[PDB]
């Protein structure tokens with residue numbers, strides 16, 4: 120049995136934790152927040168700030184197989200970077216890749232320098248898509264029809280949002296599984312589903328990874344626009360939502376793959392279906408789709424229910440949020456499981472959708 124130590128107890132952390140358990144690893148969580156979201160989901164939980172008490176972490180590091188940072192707190196990351204050489208286990212992170220990826224303008228310079236199409240900056244014609252430079256979860260993302268000098272203003276590119284994760288080991292870059300990112304009115308993601316292979320997207324994602332070169336995990340988001348594919352961002356860190364769907368649809372566990380990238384090495388390159396979504400239990404148990412930004416306001420997050428083809432997790436708080444996962448051999452069965460799941464909530468927990 121392997122033990123993974125996660126630094127970060129929210130959504131990134133949940134996904135890593137969730138996938139570590141499928142790989143049957145013990146999961147140890149470090150988080151500075153006593154009310155860390157997944158605090159009861161992890162096998163062990165140590166509440167401390169790693170910048171304040173680095174020694175506790177280095178110590179943990181003597182007793183785990185790997186440390187995975189799963190937060191986007193730049194102080195935390197830079198700090199981890201400055202002490203990484205002292206861990207007694209691999210640190211499953213690419214810090215240089217993260218440096219380009221967290222800055223959206225920098226990421227766009229990177230796209231351009233390797234010939235990858237990306238929304239045009241500062242167009243004159245409305246609409247403009249505008250969003251902060253270094254956020255995630257689409258915090259601040261907005262359509263427009265006095266921002267900052269550094270706000271990104273882009274052409275609005277209509278069409279589907281699509282995601283691919285790549286795991287690299289520095290030499291080989293394993294492009295995994297395409298997913299469809301369903302967005303809500305806040306440009307947040309409330310649902311993910313898997314897509315058919317897309318070779319162009321796959322080759323672009325390989326090049327992005329290979330020119331770093333990536334050692335660790337990144338995701339590539341693209342919009343399939345009316346004038347072709349446009350990469351809008353990359354995020355070099357363990358993602359939430361999509362790896363679960365990649366797991367059921369493709370059979371690949373990204374935590375497993377990420378762990379191999381820093382040990383064995385990885386090699387390059389199922390076809391089941393999976394639906395993954397968030398639904399807020401609203402007043403009178405009317406169900407409302409919500410994005411990550413809501414789920415992440417929660418107070419406790421753990422497993423609620425499971426039967427074959429159906430997992431349900433409850434994020435407790437100011438209106439509970441349910442994360443549902445359904446899967447099966449094809450869209451049909453999955454849809455059938457989605458129905459059974461909803462009817463579990465409906466008949467037993469008073470829900471209505």
Ligand SMILES: Nc1ncnc2c1ncn2[C@@H]1O[C@H](COP(=O)(O)OP(=O)(O)NP(=O)(O)O)[C@@H](O)[C@H]1O
Pocket residue numbers: 238248250254255256257258260273274275276277280300302306307340342351352354
């Ligand atoms: N130029 C654009 N045109 C149209 N929609 C866009 C554009 N840029 C971003 N979006 C939408 O807004 C969402 C958030 O933008 P994105 O640039 O992917 O970064 P992020 O906030 O750092 N989110 P993440 O993928 O969670 O880490 C995207 O998923 C798209 O749905």
Ligand SMILES: Nc1ncnc2c1ncn2[C@@H]1O[C@H](COP(=O)(O)OP(=O)(O)OP(=O)(O)O)[C@@H](O)[C@H]1O
Pocket residue numbers: 126127128129149150151152155156167168169170189190191192194195415
């Ligand atoms: N230096 C640190 N030491 C320990 N845990 C940390 C540190 N920095 C962040 N975390 C934890 O990682 C998780 C995700 O942090 P991140 O900043 O990516 O998201 P966030 O939504 O901004 O978190 P927060 O609730 O603090 O705003 C949080 O639970 C946070 O407490």
Ligand SMILES: NCCC[C@@H](N)C(=O)O
Pocket residue numbers: 255256282300308338340354357358359360361411
């Ligand atoms: N890889 C696409 C996932 C988007 C969002 N859940 C995130 O972690 O950025």
Ligand SMILES: [Mg+2]
Pocket residue numbers: 254255256257352353354
């Ligand atoms: Mg992003």
Ligand SMILES: [Mg+2]
Pocket residue numbers: 255256257340352
């Ligand atoms: Mg994004």
